[PDB]
Design a protein around this motif. Structure first.
Motif, PDB file in Angstrom:
ATOM      1  N   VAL A 194       0.815  -1.215   0.000  1.00 41.89           N
ATOM      2  CA  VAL A 194       0.000   0.000   0.000  1.00 41.89           C
ATOM      3  C   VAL A 194       0.851   1.268   0.000  1.00 41.89           C
ATOM      4  O   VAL A 194       0.450   2.286  -0.576  1.00 41.89           O
ATOM      5  N   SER A 195       2.022   1.240   0.631  1.00 43.20           N
ATOM      6  CA  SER A 195       2.944   2.364   0.577  1.00 43.20           C
ATOM      7  C   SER A 195       4.107   2.110  -0.372  1.00 43.20           C
ATOM      8  O   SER A 195       5.079   2.871  -0.364  1.00 43.20           O
ATOM      9  N   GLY A 196       4.027   1.069  -1.182  1.00 40.63           N
ATOM     10  CA  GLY A 196       5.079   0.736  -2.125  1.00 40.63           C
ATOM     11  C   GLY A 196       5.719  -0.595  -1.775  1.00 40.63           C
ATOM     12  O   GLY A 196       6.036  -0.871  -0.612  1.00 40.63           O
ATOM     13  N   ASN A 197       5.910  -1.431  -2.793  1.00 35.27           N
ATOM     14  CA  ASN A 197       6.545  -2.734  -2.633  1.00 35.27           C
ATOM     15  C   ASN A 197       7.980  -2.627  -3.132  1.00 35.27           C
ATOM     16  O   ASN A 197       8.217  -2.492  -4.337  1.00 35.27           O
ATOM     17  N   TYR A 198       8.935  -2.693  -2.205  1.00 34.98           N
ATOM     18  CA  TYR A 198      10.351  -2.563  -2.527  1.00 34.98           C
ATOM     19  C   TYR A 198      11.086  -3.897  -2.464  1.00 34.98           C
ATOM     20  O   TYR A 198      12.320  -3.920  -2.452  1.00 34.98           O
ATOM     21  N   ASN A 199      10.356  -5.008  -2.426  1.00 30.79           N
ATOM     22  CA  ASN A 199      10.964  -6.327  -2.340  1.00 30.79           C
ATOM     23  C   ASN A 199      11.354  -6.896  -3.697  1.00 30.79           C
ATOM     24  O   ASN A 199      11.913  -7.996  -3.751  1.00 30.79           O
ATOM     25  N   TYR A 200      11.075  -6.186  -4.786  1.00 29.08           N
ATOM     26  CA  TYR A 200      11.434  -6.635  -6.123  1.00 29.08           C
ATOM     27  C   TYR A 200      12.379  -5.620  -6.748  1.00 29.08           C
ATOM     28  O   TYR A 200      12.071  -4.425  -6.791  1.00 29.08           O
ATOM     29  N   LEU A 201      13.519  -6.102  -7.231  1.00 35.82           N
ATOM     30  CA  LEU A 201      14.601  -5.258  -7.715  1.00 35.82           C
ATOM     31  C   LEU A 201      14.818  -5.481  -9.206  1.00 35.82           C
ATOM     32  O   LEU A 201      14.562  -6.568  -9.730  1.00 35.82           O
ATOM     33  N   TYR A 202      15.292  -4.440  -9.887  1.00 45.44           N
ATOM     34  CA  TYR A 202      15.645  -4.554 -11.293  1.00 45.44           C
ATOM     35  C   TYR A 202      16.913  -3.760 -11.572  1.00 45.44           C
ATOM     36  O   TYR A 202      17.309  -2.884 -10.793  1.00 45.44           O
TER      37      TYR A 202
END
Ligand SMILES: *[C@@H]1O[C@H](CO)[C@@H](O)[C@H](O)[C@H]1NC(C)=O
Ligand SMILES: *[C@@H]1O[C@H](CO)[C@@H](O)[C@H](O)[C@H]1NC(C)=O
Ligand SMILES: *[C@@H]1O[C@H](CO)[C@@H](O)[C@H](O)[C@H]1NC(C)=O
Ligand SMILES: *[C@@H]1O[C@H](CO)[C@@H](O)[C@H](O)[C@H]1NC(C)=O
Lengths: 245, 118, 111, 265, 49, 111, 118
Positions: free
Chosen positions: E2-10
């Protein structure tokens, strides 16, 4: 003299070549990461036209002027759109835009009548009331002046330095293309099977010197097969024959 | 770059000081740079009178505005500085410097040694 | 305002540390100090511009460091003509905005 | 400044059989001794160009622009100054305005509200004047500026011995407007009708517009009244046709023949 | 999130291109051409994920 | 933001319709807005998820629809215990990520 | 499915609230679901407080970061919210709920009400 955030001037740069490499030797900047695209592809991407916008920002809140973020000087001033086709560059310009007592020539608009659409040249200011008080040329209670000059002091230091910021707006392949960055030049190697590229002349073959000369209005050379066989050299004035295999 | 300061030496206490500070060679197409007027009383803490930029704005010291006046030249000759109703506490030497916002002092002149004639 | 000792002396030739200090409320600080010497009857010139860089065309035997409210220099290569008047300057935000040290009186130790 | 005389008497034109002129280079590509058959918007061979003769006469009419026309003016006092462009005549659309008033030739692409008839020429008796260059009156949002060097000027009053002919060919591809300029000197003849001759024409400039132009007008150089000389200009059309070009060893078009005239062609 | 998903990286850049089906698991500080820069981030040096 | 009328009233049985609206700049493309009902002294329960999708356990008389910037719900066949505190909850990207109505209190005219 | 909410009845003005809620029966093999805490006082509408995913991530309301802490058991038994430095406007009832992203609050607990002793 450098443009501010309230009187931001849309600088128009056209009909030249735009290499952003001469600025690297100045100083370690406050920031380098462009916001729309990555900073590692600033040269190869060719755009139709560029729009420059110059800003003096009081303090260190240039983070809040972003494609996706707002603020006091990002909603009642120049407002960066969230779909901004371009990027930013900010650097610590303490050598020009500072005074010992205060940079009183500048100004900031803390708030306006309403939220403004982006890319609107908002320069008109007026006295602002308090909710519903009638205000016509009066000041004092419920009529306060919403503008104040920039104050630069040596006691301020970090947290009040200018960090002059220029944003650059581009257009993705819809207008005539005049300005972008150049490429590098590889020296000619004679009598070697090179994959040549003379400003778009794709092909592979060996290169010799041709005794014939072109006229000044001539740049290419054809044959019976209607293909390139002997052309004028791009960055030097002599005629080179493409000898095939 | 050379800065030459010229003015009278045998000055009466009621006589206004007219001092000209001249510079030779500077990039005037810049902002935040100016000239500073610097006192040297002997054996005491020195004090400052006026720093003037190329914008023409005035930055006077507090509670000393009646002892100082600044005159342009606008022809790259010098800067004229006038002291009115001077006190005999400042039997001292006078200097002028290039003062900007990042470099404090850049280059000085010869300076003039003046005393009260009383 | 700025304060400093008047009678300054130490080891001749090299290894002398000279300092300026004051009050963090009276002197508003946060401006990088510059420090100058005056000669009796001669042409004077600043020895240290800002805190720590060395310009070209002058003597390169000087060093400096300023921490908090206290500035200092380490001076090396003292010849027989080492007599001077050391005045340090900063920005005093209360009143009289540009102050100049507290005064120094130095002796010679070449002999 | 613009003078609104709001009256003019018009003389009937003539027709001149243009013989050979009207060829120009396709692009900047050299070919050595190769006969090419190229199809392009050309001027037909042996065609009637309409001769407007202007003498007490001030004729700068609307010209029939159909995306590429031909304008051959036999001029000696540099009468041709600029070109009124656009379609709407009320500063609502983009337009081009070139003025070579001095060595600083300026081309402005912007909104222009032209006057009724801004004649450059008037006052100072027979000596032509550089005033009334401010043709337009209002602008909405100006777009493009360009600065260029001039051609060979003319020394104010110059009448008789009409050695010079200025050929302006107007075209546009993809909104890019092409000006084709050809100045022919030392034509030692009376103006009248065109003589026989050929020349190779090179492309000089190509400037973006973005607006398809329908009409364009001629800018020519008391408030009104002038006893002008034998002003002569020929207007002609362009139509798509095929040529056959003879490239030499030096890339000069030695001969060019239109295929669609007579069965020998 | 809801406040941003930072568990996926590119990844934004590399030294060059990559052949098909290849995995670039290695992560390191990336410099720009000729500037000597290692250890930490800064000018022309930031973490590529 | 997000707003709705504070109270609404009407004849028992039928003829009621409750709506919510909000500013399109704050509203992140207007997806996943839900309609709940609160009772005094009882736990609130879900009635409508994402405008016009019916969960299990609810009756067919509840319906919801959204046009332009305004969403709304209708209910037919009202009863004596159908007074409610119908709330609309939605996503707002610029402010606090969730927004919860403006308060409703339905009353009847059966007594 | 059962949700149990426990909390104090009256609290001191300088005390810290320790609310607990227990959930019985969920499909924990999922992504995006979690446990949320919401509160409301009488006389003013609802406002959201916090939500926790199953990956340990904690999301509170903005400008309330320091005075909100969450104990997550990692045993599927109970979730504790500890809030420090309470305000007498926060005397309110509290609901613990399940939180997906389509169902903003799918199932709702009974909740507990708290008031200040001052
Ligand atoms: C570009 O190349 C031409 C032809 O060799 C030369 O005359 C000119 O000086 C060159 N310009 C630069 C900037 O290298
Ligand atoms: C040109 O005009 C003359 C006179 O009007 C006419 O006799 C002749 O046929 C015309 N020629 C062409 C090719 O139109
Ligand atoms: C010019 O272009 C517009 C673009 O739609 C077109 O509608 C019009 O027919 C064209 N021609 C003229 C003469 O305006
Ligand atoms: C081509 O140019 C050469 C050199 O100027 C000249 O000698 C030759 O006559 C020209 N050939 C022709 C007539 O096409």
């Amino acid at each position: 003299r450098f443009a501010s955030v309230y009187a931001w001037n849309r600088k128009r740069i056209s009909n030249c070549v735009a290499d952003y490499s001469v600025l690297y030797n100045l100083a370690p900047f406050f920031t380098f990461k462009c916001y729309g695209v990555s900073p590692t592809k600033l040269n190869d991407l060719c755009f139709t036209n560029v729009y420059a916008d110059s800003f003096v920002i009081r303090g260190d809140e240039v983070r809040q002027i972003a494609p996706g973020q707002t603020g006091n000087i990002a909603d009642y001033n120049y407002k960066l759109p969230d779909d901004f086709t371009g990027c930013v560059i900010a650097w610590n310009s303490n050598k020009l835009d500072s005074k010992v007592s205060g940079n009183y020539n500048y100004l900031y608009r803390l708030f306006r009548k309403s939220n403004l659409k982006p890319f609107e040249r908002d320069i008109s200011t007026e006295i602002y009331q308090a909710g519903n008080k009638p205000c016509n040329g009066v000041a004092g209670f419920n009529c306060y002046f919403p503008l104040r000059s920039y104050s630069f002091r040596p006691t301020y230091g970090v947290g009040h330095q200018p960090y002059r910021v220029v944003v650059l707006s581009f257009e993705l392949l819809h207008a005539p293309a005049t300005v972008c960055g150049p490429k590098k030049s590889t020296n000619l190697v004679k009598n070697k099977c090179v994959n040549f590229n003379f400003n778009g002349l794709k092909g592979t073959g060996v290169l010799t010197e041709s005794n014939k000369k072109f006229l000044p209005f001539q740049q290419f050379g054809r044959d019976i097969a209607d293909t390139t066989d002997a052309v004028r050299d791009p960055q030097t004035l002599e005629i080179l024959d493409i000898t095939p295999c | 770059i050379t800065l030459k300061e010229s003015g009278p030496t045998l000055v009466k206490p009621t006589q206004t000081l007219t001092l000209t500070c001249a510079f030779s060679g500077f990039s005037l197409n810049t902002g935040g740079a100016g000239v500073g007027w610097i006192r040297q009383p002997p054996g005491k803490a020195l004090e400052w009178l006026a720093l003037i930029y190329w914008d023409g704005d005035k930055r006077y010291n507090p509670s000393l505005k009646s002892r100082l006046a600044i005159i342009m030249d606008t022809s790259k000759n010098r800067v004229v500085l006038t002291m009115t109703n001077m006190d005999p506490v400042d039997t001292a030497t006078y200097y002028c410097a290039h003062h900007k916002i990042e470099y404090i002092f850049d280059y000085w002149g010869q300076g003039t040694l003046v005393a009260v004639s009383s | 305002a700025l304060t400093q000792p008047a009678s300054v002396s130490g080891s001749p030739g090299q290894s002398i540390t000279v300092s300026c200090t004051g009050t963090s409320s009276d002197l508003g600080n946060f401006q990088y100090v510059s420090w100058y010497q005056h000669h009796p009857g001669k042409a004077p010139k600043l020895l240290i511009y800002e805190v720590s860089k060395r310009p070209s065309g002058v003597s390169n035997r000087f060093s400096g460091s300023k921490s908090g409210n206290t500035a200092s220099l380490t001076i090396s290569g003292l010849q027989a003509e080492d007599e001077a008047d050391y005045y340090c300057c900063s920005y005093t935000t209360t009143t009289i905005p540009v102050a100049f040290g507290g005064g120094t009186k130095l002796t010679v130790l070449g002999q | 400044q613009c003078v609104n005389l709001t009256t003019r008497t018009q003389l009937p034109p003539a027709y001149t059989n243009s013989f050979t002129r009207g060829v120009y280079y396709p692009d900047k590509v050299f070919r050595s001794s190769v006969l090419h058959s190229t199809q392009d918007l050309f001027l037909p061979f042996f065609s009637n160009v309409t001769w407007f003769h202007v003498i007490k006469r001030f004729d700068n009419p609307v010209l029939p622009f159909n995306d590429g026309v031909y304008f051959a003016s036999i001029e000696k006092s540099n009468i041709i100054r600029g070109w009124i462009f656009g379609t709407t005549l009320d500063s609502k659309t983009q337009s081009l305005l070139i003025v070579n008033n001095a060595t600083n030739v300026v081309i402005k692409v912007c909104e222009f509200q032209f006057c009724n008839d801004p004649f450059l020429d008037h006052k100072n008796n027979k000596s032509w004047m550089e005033s009334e260059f401010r043709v337009y009156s209002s602008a909405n949002n100006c777009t493009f500026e360009y600065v260029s060097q001039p051609f060979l000027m003319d020394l104010e009053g110059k009448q008789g011995n009409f050695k010079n002919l200025r050929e302006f060919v107007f075209k546009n591809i993809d909104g890019y407007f092409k000006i084709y300029s050809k100045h022919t000197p030392i034509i030692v003849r009376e103006p009248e009708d065109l003589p026989q001759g050929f020349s190779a024409l090179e492309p000089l400039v190509d400037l973006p517009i973005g607006i398809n132009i329908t009409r364009f007008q001629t800018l020519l150089a008391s408030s009104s009244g002038w006893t002008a000389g034998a002003a002569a200009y020929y207007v002609g059309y362009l139509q798509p046709r095929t040529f056959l070009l003879k490239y030499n060893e030096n890339g000069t078009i030695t001969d060019a023949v239109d295929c669609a005239l007579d069965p020998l062609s």
